[PDB]
Amino acid sequence: LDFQALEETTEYDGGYTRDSVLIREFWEIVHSFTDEQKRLFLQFTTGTDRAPVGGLGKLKMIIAKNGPDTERLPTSHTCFNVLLLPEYSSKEKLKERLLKAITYA
Amino acid sequence: LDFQALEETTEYDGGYTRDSVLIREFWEIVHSFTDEQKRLFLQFTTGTDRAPVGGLGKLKMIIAKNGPDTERLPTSHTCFNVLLLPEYSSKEKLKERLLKAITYA
Ligand SMILES: [Ca+2]
Ligand SMILES: [Ca+2]
């Protein structure tokens, strides 16, 4: 399990970046995890303890800041979906572009 | 297939909100889709043409603005993952909180 490949593909939200103190602390902790902890981490964040094909660099993972210091635990969503939709200039254009995308792939 | 339930649970990013002109146009188009187009839309955005258990209100879907008007088509990611991580006050605390979350569920 290549957690360097996961670190290199991870995206951030809520104010975090790869340079955030919290994120640098996070990757130090994960790189120091036992193999058992690495498997539990994948189960919690992805819903499985196995890498996908192509290894962990093929995962889509976002780490998002959802509050300041707290006693509350981290949470996850294991099956998020995203539609990337440009701001087309008209309703007519949006319909043609969306129909083309869903119908021809 | 209840697309009103999907509309009610959808989240937005990149500057969109439920009040965005583009988003109001989007939901008019989707509500006017034929059942075939609704199935292709789910396949494109989720990787399957079937509702999950509990119907479409149980989907996690984000619609994110990824540019201005363009000839380029919308894109999707069908299996995104998100770790919601509070900004704990120390590395030690982050380790305890993360280990507790992954080990006890
Ligand atoms: Ca071991
Ligand atoms: Ca039909």
Residue numbers in the entry:
A (entry chain C), B (entry chain C): 742 to 846
Give the original sentences from the paper that presented this experimental model:
The HECT‐type ubiquitin ligase E6AP (UBE3A) is critically involved in several neurodevelopmental disorders and human papilloma virus‐induced cervical tumorigenesis; the structural mechanisms underlying the activity of this crucial ligase, however, are incompletely understood. The founding member of the HECT E3 family, E6AP (UBE3A), has key roles in human diseases: its activity is hijacked by the E6 protein from high‐risk human papilloma viruses to promote the proteasomal degradation of the tumor suppressor p53, thereby driving cervical tumorigenesis; genetic up‐regulation of E6AP has been linked to autism spectrum disorders; and the deletion or down‐regulation of this ligase in the brain causes Angelman's syndrome.
We determined a crystal structure of the C‐lobe of E6AP at 1.3 Å resolution. The structure reveals a dimeric arrangement, in which the C‐terminal α‐helix (H14) and adjacent β‐strand (S10) of two symmetry‐related molecules have undergone three‐dimensional domain swapping. We speculate that these alternative oxidation states originate from radiation‐induced, partial cleavage of an intermolecular disulfide bond formed during the crystallization process. As for E6AP, the hinge region in HERC6 comprises the active site, yet the swapped region is slightly offset and the subunits are tilted by ~40° with respect to the E6AP C‐lobe dimer, thus positioning the catalytic cysteine residues of the two subunits at a distance of 11 Å. In line with this notion, the hinge region is the shortest among the loops connecting individual β‐strands of the C‐lobe and may thus resemble a loaded spring that releases conformational tension upon swapping.
